[PDB]
Amino acid sequence: MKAARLKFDFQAQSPKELTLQKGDIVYIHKEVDKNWLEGEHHGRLGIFPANYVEVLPLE
């Protein structure tokens, strides 16, 4: 369902946001072009600016 791998160390600022460093891959459900992508991993939800990752669904 469209995957994206982080390419820049990002730090969560809000309780809803999730902190993840480069190399981390998450499964995004819907693409919010508003300027914030919504994703969830291991039961936990982690959101961050779409300008902090590159689109490239890996295997």
From Swiss-Prot:
Ranges in a coiled coil: none
Residues covered by the SH3 domain: 2-57
Source species, domain of life: Eukaryota
Annotated positions of the Phosphoserine modification: S14
Tissue spec. comment: Both isoforms are expressed in different tissues like heart, placenta, brain, skeletal muscle and pancreas. Isoform beta is especially found in liver.
Transmembrane segments: none
Oligomer status and interactors: Interacts with DLG5 through its third SH3 domain. Interacts with vinculin by the first two SH3 domains and the proline rich region of vinculin. Binds to SOS (guanine nucleotide exchange factor of RAS and RAC), through its third SH3 domain. The formation of this complex is down-regulated by phosphorylation of SOS. Interacts with INPPL1/SHIP2, SAFB2, SOCS7 and SRCIN1. Interacts with FASLG. Interacts with MAPK1/ERK2.
Role played: Vinexin alpha isoform promotes up-regulation of actin stress fiber formation. Vinexin beta isoform plays a role in cell spreading and enhances the activation of JNK/SAPK in response to EGF stimulation by using its third SH3 domain.
Name used for this protein in its record: Vinexin
Organism listed in the record: Homo sapiens (Human)
Gene: SORBS3
